[PDB]
From a paper:
A newly discovered class of protein organelles called encapsulin nanocompartments have been shown to be involved in microbial iron storage and redox metabolism. Here, we report the structural and mechanistic characterization of the IMEF-system found in Quasibacillus thermotolerans (Qs), an organism that does not encode any ferritins in its genome. We show that this encapsulin-based system self-assembles into a thermostable 42 nm 9.6 MDa protein compartment with a novel T = 4 topology able to mineralize and store an exceptionally large quantity of iron. In contrast to ferritin systems, IMEF encapsulins are two-component systems with the catalytic activity separated from the protein shell.
Author numbering:
A (entry chain A), B (entry chain A): 2 to 142
The structure:
Amino acid sequence: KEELDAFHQIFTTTKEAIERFMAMLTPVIENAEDDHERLYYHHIYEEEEQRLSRLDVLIPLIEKFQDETDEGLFSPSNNAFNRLLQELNLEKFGLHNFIEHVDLALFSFTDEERQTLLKELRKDAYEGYQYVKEKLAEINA
Amino acid sequence: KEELDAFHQIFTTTKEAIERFMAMLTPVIENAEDDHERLYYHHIYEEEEQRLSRLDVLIPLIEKFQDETDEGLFSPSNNAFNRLLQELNLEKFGLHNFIEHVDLALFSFTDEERQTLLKELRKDAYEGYQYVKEKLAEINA
Ligand SMILES: [Fe+3]
Ligand SMILES: [Fe+3]
């Protein structure tokens, strides 16, 4: 399945993107002016941390499926297929929420360096989201 | 299991709380001044909408377990037990994120009426979170 390879690449990319976005958020949280601003950026940080923990479950499960798509003879268990569809659907919403976190940060981090990095993260996530959305829809066969 | 009844009550309460918090957010989003503010409140709305969709899966699964805890003779399937622990753990983080959304709104909605409602939602979620956290920890038996 080329789809499983694409999913593997999309969610590996997004894991690295989370790490780069957390590194960006870290000084902002440590230097926050006042309780509201501190909670806001720490909250987004936590949501992405949670998403990273889930990706470390999803990516290995993609990998089990990939391991069998060269023999290409056995259909996945319907239990396994459903666990993978559930995890992919949840992480589709995670990608969308990440795009919006990046969009929110783009409003607040106006220097050229962070603008450039955030726009790059956003472009990758957008591409990955649109692929995941389309292929999950196509999976009502 | 008194625990399953408590979980049922905590997640039913939080579903109704999401609905009341979304009703609060709705006019704020429709009247938002400018793109940043609109995205911010619409983003929180979406995250709670996503959480509501998951609660409509979790609560029925609690209910299947409850249905058997009066005969109290059959242990759950280990597959069912694990699906319920996974969903409960995810919704523990959802409760925590909801507490933080309410905390963020408490900074911005300063009138007495919305302050009072938000503090009530926050208290219930806090109590429910602390119970879910403690009981999931205790579930390494
Ligand atoms: Fe968020
Ligand atoms: Fe949030």
